[PDB]
Enzyme design. Structure first.
Site, PDB file in Angstrom:
ATOM      1  N   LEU A 114       1.713  -8.460   5.969  1.00  0.00           N
ATOM      2  CA  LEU A 114       0.245  -9.035   6.545  1.00  0.00           C
ATOM      3  C   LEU A 114       0.153 -10.378   6.884  1.00  0.00           C
ATOM      4  CD1 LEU A 114      -1.737  -6.732   6.076  1.00  0.00           C
ATOM      5  CD2 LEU A 114       0.150  -6.678   4.507  1.00  0.00           C
ATOM      6  N   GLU A 140      -8.087  -7.515  -3.103  1.00  0.00           N
ATOM      7  CA  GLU A 140      -8.528  -6.981  -1.625  1.00  0.00           C
ATOM      8  C   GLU A 140      -7.619  -5.517  -1.666  1.00  0.00           C
ATOM      9  OE1 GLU A 140      -9.358  -5.497   2.175  1.00  0.00           O
ATOM     10  OE2 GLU A 140      -7.296  -5.911   1.736  1.00  0.00           O
TER      11      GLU A 140
HETATM   12  N1  LIG Z   1      -5.018  -3.629   7.144  1.00  0.00           N
HETATM   13  C1  LIG Z   1      -4.038  -4.252   7.858  1.00  0.00           C
HETATM   14  O1  LIG Z   1      -4.009  -5.506   7.882  1.00  0.00           O
HETATM   15  C2  LIG Z   1      -2.813  -3.532   8.181  1.00  0.00           C
HETATM   16  C3  LIG Z   1      -2.826  -2.082   8.475  1.00  0.00           C
HETATM   17  C4  LIG Z   1      -1.780  -1.265   8.836  1.00  0.00           C
HETATM   18  C5  LIG Z   1      -0.482  -2.156   9.224  1.00  0.00           C
HETATM   19  N2  LIG Z   1      -0.609  -3.645   9.225  1.00  0.00           N
HETATM   20  C6  LIG Z   1       0.684  -4.572   9.745  1.00  0.00           C
HETATM   21  O2  LIG Z   1       0.967  -3.934  10.981  1.00  0.00           O
HETATM   22  C7  LIG Z   1       2.212  -3.928  11.314  1.00  0.00           C
HETATM   23  C8  LIG Z   1       2.477  -2.438  11.340  1.00  0.00           C
HETATM   24  O3  LIG Z   1       1.677  -2.074  12.298  1.00  0.00           O
HETATM   25  P1  LIG Z   1       2.200  -1.360  13.755  1.00  0.00           P
HETATM   26  O4  LIG Z   1       0.968  -1.124  14.695  1.00  0.00           O
HETATM   27  O5  LIG Z   1       3.127  -2.596  14.418  1.00  0.00           O
HETATM   28  O6  LIG Z   1       2.990  -0.078  13.658  1.00  0.00           O
HETATM   29  P2  LIG Z   1       2.741   1.383  13.011  1.00  0.00           P
HETATM   30  O7  LIG Z   1       1.636   2.077  13.927  1.00  0.00           O
HETATM   31  O8  LIG Z   1       2.535   1.584  11.605  1.00  0.00           O
HETATM   32  O9  LIG Z   1       4.041   2.066  13.440  1.00  0.00           O
HETATM   33  C9  LIG Z   1       4.250   2.021  14.759  1.00  0.00           C
HETATM   34  C10 LIG Z   1       5.291   3.134  15.110  1.00  0.00           C
HETATM   35  O10 LIG Z   1       4.639   4.430  14.297  1.00  0.00           O
HETATM   36  C11 LIG Z   1       4.921   5.550  14.746  1.00  0.00           C
HETATM   37  N3  LIG Z   1       3.518   6.007  15.418  1.00  0.00           N
HETATM   38  C12 LIG Z   1       2.268   5.067  15.897  1.00  0.00           C
HETATM   39  N4  LIG Z   1       1.460   6.122  16.244  1.00  0.00           N
HETATM   40  C13 LIG Z   1       1.807   7.328  16.236  1.00  0.00           C
HETATM   41  C14 LIG Z   1       1.475   8.511  16.627  1.00  0.00           C
HETATM   42  N5  LIG Z   1       0.124   8.618  17.169  1.00  0.00           N
HETATM   43  N6  LIG Z   1       2.002   9.592  16.780  1.00  0.00           N
HETATM   44  C15 LIG Z   1       3.330   9.690  16.240  1.00  0.00           C
HETATM   45  N7  LIG Z   1       3.854   8.335  15.780  1.00  0.00           N
HETATM   46  C16 LIG Z   1       3.273   7.305  15.843  1.00  0.00           C
HETATM   47  C17 LIG Z   1       5.808   5.382  16.238  1.00  0.00           C
HETATM   48  O11 LIG Z   1       7.253   5.708  15.431  1.00  0.00           O
HETATM   49  P3  LIG Z   1       8.302   6.212  16.333  1.00  0.00           P
HETATM   50  O12 LIG Z   1       8.974   5.097  17.296  1.00  0.00           O
HETATM   51  O13 LIG Z   1       9.368   6.554  15.203  1.00  0.00           O
HETATM   52  O14 LIG Z   1       7.865   7.392  17.124  1.00  0.00           O
HETATM   53  C18 LIG Z   1       5.684   3.733  16.315  1.00  0.00           C
HETATM   54  O15 LIG Z   1       6.802   3.072  17.049  1.00  0.00           O
HETATM   55  C19 LIG Z   1       2.791  -4.413   9.745  1.00  0.00           C
HETATM   56  O16 LIG Z   1       2.841  -5.903  10.014  1.00  0.00           O
HETATM   57  C20 LIG Z   1       1.862  -4.210   8.824  1.00  0.00           C
HETATM   58  O17 LIG Z   1       2.033  -5.218   7.736  1.00  0.00           O
HETATM   59  C21 LIG Z   1      -1.681  -4.229   8.715  1.00  0.00           C
HETATM   60  N1  LIG Z   2      -8.538  -3.223   3.483  1.00  0.00           N
HETATM   61  C1  LIG Z   2      -7.113  -3.244   3.731  1.00  0.00           C
HETATM   62  N2  LIG Z   2      -6.187  -4.103   3.208  1.00  0.00           N
HETATM   63  C2  LIG Z   2      -4.974  -4.171   3.490  1.00  0.00           C
HETATM   64  O1  LIG Z   2      -4.277  -4.952   3.032  1.00  0.00           O
HETATM   65  C3  LIG Z   2      -4.456  -2.890   4.171  1.00  0.00           C
HETATM   66  N3  LIG Z   2      -2.924  -2.784   4.388  1.00  0.00           N
HETATM   67  C4  LIG Z   2      -2.538  -1.996   5.096  1.00  0.00           C
HETATM   68  C5  LIG Z   2      -1.448  -1.593   5.331  1.00  0.00           C
HETATM   69  N4  LIG Z   2      -0.518  -2.264   4.366  1.00  0.00           N
HETATM   70  C6  LIG Z   2      -0.323  -1.969   3.169  1.00  0.00           C
HETATM   71  C7  LIG Z   2       0.611  -2.873   2.343  1.00  0.00           C
HETATM   72  C8  LIG Z   2       0.711  -2.848   0.866  1.00  0.00           C
HETATM   73  C9  LIG Z   2      -0.165  -1.629   0.265  1.00  0.00           C
HETATM   74  C10 LIG Z   2       0.121  -1.417  -1.084  1.00  0.00           C
HETATM   75  O2  LIG Z   2       1.168  -2.081  -1.893  1.00  0.00           O
HETATM   76  N5  LIG Z   2      -0.886  -0.642  -1.725  1.00  0.00           N
HETATM   77  C11 LIG Z   2      -1.021  -0.449  -3.257  1.00  0.00           C
HETATM   78  C12 LIG Z   2      -1.198  -1.622  -4.039  1.00  0.00           C
HETATM   79  C13 LIG Z   2      -0.797  -1.488  -5.401  1.00  0.00           C
HETATM   80  C14 LIG Z   2      -0.896  -2.860  -6.130  1.00  0.00           C
HETATM   81  O3  LIG Z   2      -1.674  -3.692  -5.926  1.00  0.00           O
HETATM   82  O4  LIG Z   2      -0.295  -2.890  -7.205  1.00  0.00           O
HETATM   83  C15 LIG Z   2      -1.721   0.608  -3.415  1.00  0.00           C
HETATM   84  O5  LIG Z   2      -1.459   1.467  -4.621  1.00  0.00           O
HETATM   85  O6  LIG Z   2      -2.479   0.911  -2.635  1.00  0.00           O
HETATM   86  C16 LIG Z   2      -0.905  -0.884   1.043  1.00  0.00           C
HETATM   87  C17 LIG Z   2      -0.995  -1.187   2.580  1.00  0.00           C
HETATM   88  C18 LIG Z   2      -3.513  -0.873   5.731  1.00  0.00           C
HETATM   89  N6  LIG Z   2      -4.867  -0.796   5.554  1.00  0.00           N
HETATM   90  C19 LIG Z   2      -5.413  -1.956   4.761  1.00  0.00           C
HETATM   91  N7  LIG Z   2      -6.575  -1.847   4.543  1.00  0.00           N
END
Ligand SMILES: NC(=O)c1ccc[n+]([C@@H]2O[C@H](COP(=O)([O-])OP(=O)(O)OC[C@H]3O[C@@H](n4cnc5c(N)ncnc54)[C@H](OP(=O)(O)O)[C@@H]3O)[C@@H](O)[C@H]2O)c1
Ligand SMILES: Nc1nc(=O)c2nc(CNc3ccc(C(=O)N[C@@H](CCC(=O)O)C(=O)O)cc3)cnc2[nH]1
Length: 185
Positions: free
Chosen positions: A21, A29
Protein backbone atom coordinates in the site's frame (compact mmCIF):
# COMPACT_ATOMS: atom_id res chain seq x y z
CA UNK A 1 -25.82 -12.29 -8.61
CA UNK A 2 -24.13 -8.87 -7.98
CA UNK A 3 -20.45 -7.85 -7.40
CA UNK A 4 -18.88 -5.69 -4.66
CA UNK A 5 -15.55 -3.87 -5.25
CA UNK A 6 -13.60 -2.69 -2.17
CA UNK A 7 -10.55 -0.36 -2.50
CA UNK A 8 -8.63 2.34 -0.58
CA UNK A 9 -7.35 5.15 -2.91
CA UNK A 10 -5.08 8.21 -2.28
CA UNK A 11 -6.26 11.66 -3.50
CA UNK A 12 -4.00 11.05 -6.60
CA UNK A 13 -5.99 7.76 -7.17
CA UNK A 14 -3.02 5.59 -5.99
CA UNK A 15 -3.73 2.05 -4.63
CA UNK A 16 -0.19 0.52 -4.67
CA UNK A 17 3.54 1.24 -4.29
CA UNK A 18 6.35 -1.41 -4.53
CA UNK A 19 3.79 -4.29 -4.29
CA UNK A 20 2.41 -2.88 -0.96
CA UNK A 21 0.00 0.00 0.00
CA UNK A 22 1.23 3.60 -0.64
CA UNK A 23 0.27 4.69 2.95
CA UNK A 24 1.50 3.20 6.27
CA UNK A 25 -0.75 0.48 7.81
CA UNK A 26 -4.20 1.80 8.95
CA UNK A 27 -5.35 -0.92 11.43
CA UNK A 28 -9.08 0.09 11.59
CA UNK A 29 -9.22 0.62 7.75
CA UNK A 30 -7.79 -2.96 7.37
CA UNK A 31 -10.42 -4.11 9.96
CA UNK A 32 -13.13 -2.38 7.78
CA UNK A 33 -11.81 -4.31 4.70
CA UNK A 34 -11.80 -7.55 6.79
CA UNK A 35 -15.37 -6.91 8.12
CA UNK A 36 -16.87 -5.90 4.73
CA UNK A 37 -15.24 -8.83 2.80
CA UNK A 38 -15.80 -11.45 5.62
CA UNK A 39 -19.32 -10.50 6.86
CA UNK A 40 -21.91 -13.14 5.84
CA UNK A 41 -25.14 -13.67 7.88
CA UNK A 42 -26.02 -16.87 5.86
CA UNK A 43 -24.87 -19.76 8.15
CA UNK A 44 -22.94 -22.48 6.20
CA UNK A 45 -21.71 -20.02 3.48
CA UNK A 46 -18.65 -17.69 3.12
CA UNK A 47 -17.87 -14.68 0.86
CA UNK A 48 -15.70 -15.17 -2.28
CA UNK A 49 -12.72 -12.72 -2.51
CA UNK A 50 -11.37 -12.40 -6.11
CA UNK A 51 -7.94 -10.72 -6.64
CA UNK A 52 -5.11 -10.51 -9.22
CA UNK A 53 -1.85 -12.44 -8.54
CA UNK A 54 0.14 -9.31 -7.44
CA UNK A 55 -2.63 -8.38 -4.90
CA UNK A 56 -2.39 -12.00 -3.54
CA UNK A 57 1.42 -11.67 -2.92
CA UNK A 58 0.91 -8.09 -1.49
CA UNK A 59 -1.02 -9.77 1.42
CA UNK A 60 1.56 -10.77 4.11
CA UNK A 61 1.93 -14.63 4.06
CA UNK A 62 0.68 -15.01 7.71
CA UNK A 63 -2.66 -13.38 6.55
CA UNK A 64 -2.96 -15.82 3.54
CA UNK A 65 -5.44 -17.11 2.83
CA UNK A 66 -7.69 -14.23 4.07
CA UNK A 67 -9.45 -16.16 6.91
CA UNK A 68 -13.27 -16.68 6.94
CA UNK A 69 -13.36 -16.05 3.13
CA UNK A 70 -12.95 -18.21 -0.03
CA UNK A 71 -9.75 -16.82 -1.70
CA UNK A 72 -9.72 -16.98 -5.55
CA UNK A 73 -6.69 -15.66 -7.57
CA UNK A 74 -6.86 -14.55 -11.26
CA UNK A 75 -3.73 -15.52 -13.32
CA UNK A 76 -3.44 -16.39 -17.08
CA UNK A 77 0.14 -17.85 -16.66
CA UNK A 78 -0.49 -19.95 -13.49
CA UNK A 79 -2.19 -23.44 -13.39
CA UNK A 80 -2.18 -24.17 -9.61
CA UNK A 81 -3.72 -21.78 -7.02
CA UNK A 82 -0.72 -20.04 -5.32
CA UNK A 83 0.33 -21.66 -1.97
CA UNK A 84 -2.66 -21.15 0.44
CA UNK A 85 -5.21 -19.77 -2.12
CA UNK A 86 -8.51 -21.80 -2.36
CA UNK A 87 -9.08 -21.37 -6.18
CA UNK A 88 -7.49 -20.08 -9.43
CA UNK A 89 -9.34 -18.76 -12.57
CA UNK A 90 -7.98 -17.45 -15.94
CA UNK A 91 -10.71 -14.71 -16.18
CA UNK A 92 -13.37 -12.91 -14.05
CA UNK A 93 -16.08 -14.76 -16.11
CA UNK A 94 -14.43 -18.14 -15.17
CA UNK A 95 -14.38 -17.08 -11.46
CA UNK A 96 -18.11 -16.05 -11.61
CA UNK A 97 -18.88 -19.30 -13.61
CA UNK A 98 -17.25 -21.25 -10.69
CA UNK A 99 -19.96 -19.81 -8.31
CA UNK A 100 -22.71 -21.98 -9.97
CA UNK A 101 -20.44 -25.09 -10.44
CA UNK A 102 -20.09 -27.92 -7.84
CA UNK A 103 -16.88 -26.37 -6.32
CA UNK A 104 -18.73 -23.24 -4.96
CA UNK A 105 -22.50 -24.06 -5.44
CA UNK A 106 -24.32 -23.02 -2.18
CA UNK A 107 -20.86 -22.23 -0.61
CA UNK A 108 -20.77 -18.48 -1.58
CA UNK A 109 -22.81 -15.66 0.08
CA UNK A 110 -21.31 -12.44 -1.45
CA UNK A 111 -18.58 -11.83 -4.09
CA UNK A 112 -15.91 -9.19 -3.28
CA UNK A 113 -13.44 -7.93 -5.96
CA UNK A 114 -10.29 -6.80 -4.07
CA UNK A 115 -7.90 -7.40 -7.02
CA UNK A 116 -5.57 -4.91 -8.72
CA UNK A 117 -6.23 -2.17 -11.34
CA UNK A 118 -7.25 -4.45 -14.29
CA UNK A 119 -9.62 -6.55 -12.03
CA UNK A 120 -11.43 -3.35 -10.79
CA UNK A 121 -11.55 -1.84 -14.34
CA UNK A 122 -13.24 -5.06 -15.66
CA UNK A 123 -15.48 -5.59 -12.56
CA UNK A 124 -16.61 -1.90 -12.83
CA UNK A 125 -17.74 -2.52 -16.50
CA UNK A 126 -19.48 -5.90 -15.64
CA UNK A 127 -23.26 -5.86 -16.38
CA UNK A 128 -25.82 -5.97 -13.50
CA UNK A 129 -25.67 -4.25 -10.06
CA UNK A 130 -22.18 -3.13 -8.84
CA UNK A 131 -21.28 -1.47 -5.50
CA UNK A 132 -17.82 0.21 -5.08
CA UNK A 133 -16.82 0.48 -1.39
CA UNK A 134 -14.13 3.22 -1.83
CA UNK A 135 -11.98 4.46 1.11
CA UNK A 136 -10.85 8.00 0.10
CA UNK A 137 -7.37 8.33 1.74
CA UNK A 138 -7.41 12.17 1.97
CA UNK A 139 -3.65 12.67 1.29
CA UNK A 140 -1.63 12.32 -1.95
CA UNK A 141 0.72 9.26 -1.78
CA UNK A 142 3.51 8.28 -4.24
CA UNK A 143 1.98 5.27 -6.11
CA UNK A 144 2.96 3.00 -9.09
CA UNK A 145 -0.59 1.49 -9.49
CA UNK A 146 -3.88 3.47 -9.62
CA UNK A 147 -7.68 2.91 -9.42
CA UNK A 148 -9.40 3.68 -12.77
CA UNK A 149 -11.65 6.82 -12.87
CA UNK A 150 -15.24 6.07 -11.63
CA UNK A 151 -17.64 6.57 -14.63
CA UNK A 152 -20.30 9.05 -13.31
CA UNK A 153 -22.47 8.16 -16.39
CA UNK A 154 -23.31 4.83 -14.57
CA UNK A 155 -21.97 5.24 -10.95
CA UNK A 156 -23.51 7.59 -8.31
CA UNK A 157 -22.13 8.23 -4.76
CA UNK A 158 -24.66 7.14 -2.04
CA UNK A 159 -25.00 9.84 0.69
CA UNK A 160 -24.73 7.29 3.55
CA UNK A 161 -24.75 3.45 3.73
CA UNK A 162 -25.99 1.25 6.62
CA UNK A 163 -22.98 -0.37 8.40
CA UNK A 164 -20.51 2.21 6.90
CA UNK A 165 -19.40 5.25 9.02
CA UNK A 166 -20.32 8.58 7.27
CA UNK A 167 -17.87 10.94 9.10
CA UNK A 168 -14.19 11.43 8.08
CA UNK A 169 -11.99 8.94 10.02
CA UNK A 170 -8.39 9.51 11.19
CA UNK A 171 -5.73 6.88 12.03
CA UNK A 172 -1.95 7.43 12.46
CA UNK A 173 -2.56 11.14 11.56
CA UNK A 174 -4.06 10.16 8.15
CA UNK A 175 -7.68 11.21 7.50
CA UNK A 176 -9.93 9.05 5.28
CA UNK A 177 -13.62 8.80 4.31
CA UNK A 178 -15.68 5.63 3.57
CA UNK A 179 -17.73 6.05 0.33
CA UNK A 180 -20.06 3.64 -1.50
CA UNK A 181 -20.87 4.03 -5.22
CA UNK A 182 -23.58 2.14 -7.14
CA UNK A 183 -24.66 1.61 -10.78
CA UNK A 184 -27.89 -0.12 -12.02
CA UNK A 185 -26.63 -0.77 -15.58
N1 LIG B 1 -7.26 -1.10 -2.04
C1 LIG B 1 -6.00 -0.98 -2.36
O1 LIG B 1 -5.38 0.02 -1.99
C2 LIG B 1 -5.38 -2.07 -3.19
C3 LIG B 1 -6.11 -3.12 -3.73
C4 LIG B 1 -5.47 -4.08 -4.50
C5 LIG B 1 -4.10 -3.97 -4.73
N2 LIG B 1 -3.40 -2.95 -4.19
C6 LIG B 1 -1.97 -2.81 -4.46
O2 LIG B 1 -1.80 -2.82 -5.88
C7 LIG B 1 -0.68 -3.62 -6.24
C8 LIG B 1 -1.16 -4.89 -6.94
O3 LIG B 1 -2.14 -4.58 -7.93
P1 LIG B 1 -1.82 -4.67 -9.51
O4 LIG B 1 -2.87 -3.98 -10.34
O5 LIG B 1 -0.37 -4.24 -9.66
O6 LIG B 1 -1.85 -6.27 -9.81
P2 LIG B 1 -3.08 -7.34 -9.70
O7 LIG B 1 -4.22 -6.92 -10.62
O8 LIG B 1 -3.30 -7.85 -8.30
O9 LIG B 1 -2.25 -8.54 -10.37
C9 LIG B 1 -1.80 -8.44 -11.72
C10 LIG B 1 -1.71 -9.86 -12.24
O10 LIG B 1 -2.88 -10.59 -11.82
C11 LIG B 1 -3.36 -11.35 -12.92
N3 LIG B 1 -4.61 -10.78 -13.46
C12 LIG B 1 -5.06 -9.51 -13.37
N4 LIG B 1 -6.26 -9.39 -14.00
C13 LIG B 1 -6.57 -10.60 -14.51
C14 LIG B 1 -7.69 -11.19 -15.29
N5 LIG B 1 -8.74 -10.44 -15.67
N6 LIG B 1 -7.61 -12.50 -15.61
C15 LIG B 1 -6.56 -13.27 -15.25
N7 LIG B 1 -5.52 -12.80 -14.53
C16 LIG B 1 -5.48 -11.50 -14.15
C17 LIG B 1 -2.26 -11.33 -13.97
O11 LIG B 1 -1.38 -12.40 -13.64
P3 LIG B 1 -0.59 -13.33 -14.72
O12 LIG B 1 0.52 -12.43 -15.20
O13 LIG B 1 -0.08 -14.47 -13.89
O14 LIG B 1 -1.65 -13.67 -15.75
C18 LIG B 1 -1.63 -9.98 -13.75
O15 LIG B 1 -0.29 -9.88 -14.23
C19 LIG B 1 0.05 -3.87 -4.93
O16 LIG B 1 0.91 -2.76 -4.64
C20 LIG B 1 -1.05 -3.89 -3.90
O17 LIG B 1 -0.56 -3.62 -2.57
C21 LIG B 1 -4.02 -2.02 -3.45
N1 LIG C 1 -10.62 -0.61 1.78
C1 LIG C 1 -9.54 -1.33 1.42
N2 LIG C 1 -8.37 -1.16 2.13
C2 LIG C 1 -7.26 -1.86 1.80
O1 LIG C 1 -6.19 -1.71 2.45
C3 LIG C 1 -7.36 -2.83 0.69
N3 LIG C 1 -6.34 -3.58 0.28
C4 LIG C 1 -6.50 -4.43 -0.75
C5 LIG C 1 -5.33 -5.30 -1.18
N4 LIG C 1 -4.33 -5.46 -0.12
C6 LIG C 1 -4.52 -6.09 1.07
C7 LIG C 1 -3.45 -6.18 1.96
C8 LIG C 1 -3.58 -6.80 3.19
C9 LIG C 1 -4.80 -7.36 3.57
C10 LIG C 1 -4.96 -8.03 4.91
O2 LIG C 1 -3.97 -8.35 5.56
N5 LIG C 1 -6.19 -8.27 5.37
C11 LIG C 1 -6.44 -8.94 6.63
C12 LIG C 1 -6.29 -8.02 7.84
C13 LIG C 1 -6.10 -8.85 9.11
C14 LIG C 1 -5.59 -8.04 10.26
O3 LIG C 1 -5.68 -6.79 10.23
O4 LIG C 1 -5.12 -8.67 11.23
C15 LIG C 1 -7.82 -9.53 6.61
O5 LIG C 1 -8.05 -10.48 7.37
O6 LIG C 1 -8.67 -9.05 5.83
C16 LIG C 1 -5.88 -7.25 2.68
C17 LIG C 1 -5.74 -6.63 1.45
C18 LIG C 1 -7.73 -4.54 -1.40
N6 LIG C 1 -8.78 -3.80 -1.04
C19 LIG C 1 -8.66 -2.94 -0.01
N7 LIG C 1 -9.67 -2.18 0.39
Amino acid sequence: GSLNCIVAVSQNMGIGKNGDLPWPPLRNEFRYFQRMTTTSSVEGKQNLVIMGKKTWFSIPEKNRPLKGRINLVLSRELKEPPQGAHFLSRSLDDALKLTEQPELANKVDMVWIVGGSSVYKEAMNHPGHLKLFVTRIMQDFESDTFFPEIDLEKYKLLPEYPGVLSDVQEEKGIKYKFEVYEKND
